[PDB]
Design a binder for this molecule. Structure first.
Ligand SMILES: C[C@H](Nc1cc(F)c(S(=O)(=O)Nc2cscn2)cc1Cl)c1cc(F)ccc1F
Ligand SMILES: C[C@H](Nc1cc(F)c(S(=O)(=O)Nc2cscn2)cc1Cl)c1cc(F)ccc1F
Lengths: 284, 293
């Protein structure tokens, strides 16, 4: 309700509008699939077997291209979709870097802390953004004309998939999603963060603003614990991020797939010296 | 009876055509590659006649990979624009691959090689489409309405009432219901190939003499391997199908020319085979006939 909190929300909403391509209209020129080490490979097959999707592409003319992924025989076939996913990820991360760049509170932080927080949060803000275009009924991320759909076997076992169903079930507003994004972004306990106390205070103010928004703009006591439900989802998302970073690195080690922007974000081969693309993107 | 009921020359004749079929028909489509696909993401009365045929023959396209995956292309509903032409480049590439197989098929048959070069062109110009349709029917699944071309599958769009009107589809459903042997398919290809009354045939009599012996051999073959009353009048049924196919060949050429006129899609070989000295204009055909094997 306070005017600072109103302008705080309006800044994030403005940011989200300027930087989230909801229709995926500008995502193009992306790749598609074609037409001791054993212990690493065993683990990498297990990693990919959880998060399998079919890919649907609706043409401007009314046509539909549908990709169904191969069953694991035990070879490079399991990596089929990695080049496409990397391009989609990279496209999404560029959106998140822009999102952070228009927040005044973020720009005021030293560039090393801006990098550290984006390293920490990029994945989480992608997943939060992907949740807004997720369809729980059909199990499908509707990315404009491009569309990722889960394969059968149940699915709820995989922490990342469980997260998407649970968050979507909360039926959050646009304002609540951007406030989740701000709380994730401004996390004081990410590695390499010098200004711990300032970021912690900013996080608190975003949390209070969300807590106050839910209190004021929703029925009570119906949504009595909704702020805490959101906080549980952020903690659970932070856990998934750690799990994800491990999985990606294991895969990368065997089968190099990551774009240069991803390599920097996940720590693949001074803080500004090691993250030159990210640094360049934050200056421009 | 078995093959003992055929003369030595007839056994030899069938043996040659079958050997030829085996050497020149890639039934799994392993060597068909580097083809176009539909891209990812008073005059007006002509457009009407083009649209009507292309509706009936509309197919979805499936692409299995050795890795295990499937790429599936469902084509667009008629919006009233260029979208109706999206599969033509592909279909033209598949056609050209099939035609190269038919040209190779003709080449290894002795009776064809001994003809003059101009007749070889004239007969292939006359029978290319026919022999392709005969080959396509051998991979046609009637239950699913799908031509199963190994890794490629072309599947008809959604049933039988609308589709059995269209002569080319009706042809495929009818010929499949006869349940022909390989030997009967290759002898149909011979009878179509050796047609004495194609345009530009100089050796009318020698081609006619050859045709008659292939028809005689087919009749004798049927009589030696078809004892049951399920296959009554099978020879005459087959010959009526070849007459029907030649009608569909005329109707097909006239579609192609109408489409090519408004939306150019044909490969240089298709231009030669459909006309878009005899040897000089038919440059690629002449080349392919000289290359042997
Ligand atoms: C919609 C969402 N897409 C998605 C999620 C990612 F984490 C990445 S990544 O961070 O770049 N890592 C990565 C790339 S190839 C293997 N790992 C990229 C994408 Cl496109 C998604 C979520 C899910 F639970 C199951 C399937 C999905 F497609
Ligand atoms: C399987 C077969 N495909 C096929 C048929 C053709 F006639 C030609 S063509 O002769 O080159 N001319 C042509 C090229 S683009 C339109 N016409 C090529 C192909 Cl690949 C088929 C048969 C059918 F009855 C209905 C649909 C079909 F796709």
């Amino acid at each position: 309700l306070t005017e600072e909190q109103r302008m705080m929300i309006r800044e994030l909403m403005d940011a989200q509008m300027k930087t989230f391509d909801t229709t995926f209209s500008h995502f193009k020129n992306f790749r598609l699939p074609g037409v001791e080490e054993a212990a690493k490979w065993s683990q990498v097959r297990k990693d990919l077997c959880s998060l399998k999707v079919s890919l649907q592409l609706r043409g401007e003319d009314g046509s539909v291209w549908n990709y169904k992924p191969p069953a694991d025989s035990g070879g490079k076939e399991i990596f089929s979709l990695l080049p496409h996913m990397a391009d989609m990820s990279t496209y999404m991360f560029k959106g998140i870097i822009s999102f952070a760049k228009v927040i005044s509170y973020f720009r005021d932080l030293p560039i090393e802390d801006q990098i550290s927080l984006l390293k920490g949060a990029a994945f989480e803000l992608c997943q939060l953004r992907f949740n807004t275009v997720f369809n729980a009924e059909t199990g499908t991320w509707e990315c404009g004309r491009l569309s990722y759909c889960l394969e059968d076997t149940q699915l709820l076992l995989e922490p990342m998939l469980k997260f998407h169903y649970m968050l979507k079930k909360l039926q959050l507003h646009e304002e609540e999603y951007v406030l989740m994004q701000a709380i994730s972004l401004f996390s004081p306990d990410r590695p390499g963060v010098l200004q711990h106390r300032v970021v912690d205070q900013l996080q608190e103010q975003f949390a209070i603003t969300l807590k106050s928004y839910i209190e004021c703009n929703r029925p009570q006591p119906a949504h009595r614990f909704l702020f805490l439900k959101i906080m549980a989802m952020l903690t659970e998302l932070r856990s998934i991020n750690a799990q994800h970073t491990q999985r990606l690195l294991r895969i990368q080690d065997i089968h190099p797939f990551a774009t240069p922007l991803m390599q920097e974000l996940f720590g693949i081969t001074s803080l500004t010296e090691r993250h030159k693309i990210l640094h360049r993107l934050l200056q421009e």
